């Protein structure tokens, strides 16, 4: 699970040595990014309901056939809309967990690994979730180091889906 501290300890254990100043610099970079990551996680946490509702609305605007055509994979009925909102909430929550963790590790362990089999099996287009993550990129309202750290996780999930 990728985190600067866990990967530094994994590297030092794989070479079987103590934590030299290289891993100290890794921890310093984690510690420097940590306040912006926690502030970004708090902002996404208390704006998450509006972000998820707007992201579902943006996906339904770009892909109206999800709301019109029948099917278990589509949001034409109520349960499809609830499952789409819960999936977008899962994406945003794992992005906040990546912001707290300071790496893409929550995305790898929780969402990125095996998402191709889920999209293949239940016939979900990854472009829907890509458009949802683009909505999260466009309207999360952050600036500076908090925006660049949060958009990196959103682009990492976009890169994994596209």
């Amino acid at each position: 699970m990728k985190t600067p501290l866990t990967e530094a300890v994994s590297t030092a254990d794989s070479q079987g040595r103590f934590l030299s100043s290289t891993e100290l610099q890794i921890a310093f970079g984690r510690l420097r990014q940590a306040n912006a990551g926690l502030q970004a996680a708090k902002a996404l946490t208390d704006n998450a309901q509006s972000l998820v509702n707007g992201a579902a609305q943006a996906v339904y605007n770009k892909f109206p056939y999800t709301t019109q055509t029948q099917g278990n994979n589509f949001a034409a009925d109520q349960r499809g809309k609830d499952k789409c909102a819960r999936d977008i909430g899962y994406y945003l929550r794992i992005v906040t967990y990546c912001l707290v963790a300071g790496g893409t590790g929550p995305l790898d362990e929780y969402l990125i690994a095996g998402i191709d089999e889920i999209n293949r099996t239940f016939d979900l287009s990854p472009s829907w979730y890509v458009e949802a993550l683009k909505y999260i990129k466009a309207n999360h309202g952050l600036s500076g180091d908090a925006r660049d750290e949060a958009n990196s996780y959103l682009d990492y999930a976009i890169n994994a889906l596209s």
Binding site: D108, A113, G114, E117
Partner: protein, 197 residues
């Protein structure tokens, strides 16, 4: 595919650094990096057979004749010969078909990586590698594993690693002891009608 589920390492003798002179109870390096006589190549092939198939399946029907001939000509490395022993029909029928995925993972980790499994969790983790990628996918994962390499590389017959500590009459149990099948296939052979008196 999917990433292997994480398993914690359990302390085994191969994990720590070996503070020993090789001496008596060292496993002899069977390597092709030095130029060998055909007799020494034959003992190296027999050592690979003894590591993979144990002593019992060193019979003439289980000898891979074309694989031996390609290995003599250095068409393949020692690691590829070990792969061909693991991909052999005899190995698959005798060892793989008579075991589940868990005990076969334990057998292949012992006979290829030279170390025991850490726990049941490692057997669980590599058993789904068996169940999705087949036996060839699993063997290839084990033979491309950094462990296999940093220990044996490409040109050394694998051996049980750190079986016995210096100045110890006895250490860990030898890998030769493990049978083709466990007690489940034993009682299944007993249930089909064998082994009774």
């Amino acid at each position: 595919t999917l990433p292997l589920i994480a398993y914690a390492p359990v302390s085994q003798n191969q994990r720590v650094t070996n503070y020993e002179v090789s001496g008596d109870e060292h496993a002899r390096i069977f390597t092709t990096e030095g130029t060998l006589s055909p007799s020494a190549m034959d003992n190296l092939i027999a050592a690979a057979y003894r590591q993979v198939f144990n002593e019992q399946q060193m019979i003439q029907s289980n000898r891979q004749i074309a694989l031996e001939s390609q290995f003599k000509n250095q068409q393949i490395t020692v690691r590829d010969f070990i792969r061909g022993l693991a991909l052999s029909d005899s190995f698959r029928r005798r060892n793989f078909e008579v075991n589940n995925n868990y005990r076969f993972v334990q057998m292949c980790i012992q006979r290829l990586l030279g170390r025991d499994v850490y726990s049941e969790e490692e057997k669980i983790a590599w058993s789904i590698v068996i169940a999705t990628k087949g036996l060839p996918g699993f063997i290839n994962e084990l033979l491309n594993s950094q462990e296999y390499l940093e220990n044996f590389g490409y040109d050394t017959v694998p051996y049980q690693r750190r079986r016995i500590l210096p100045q110890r009459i006895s250490g860990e149990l030898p890998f030769a002891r493990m049978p083709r099948y466990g007690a489940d296939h034993r009682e299944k052979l007993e249930a089909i009608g064998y082994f009774r008196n």
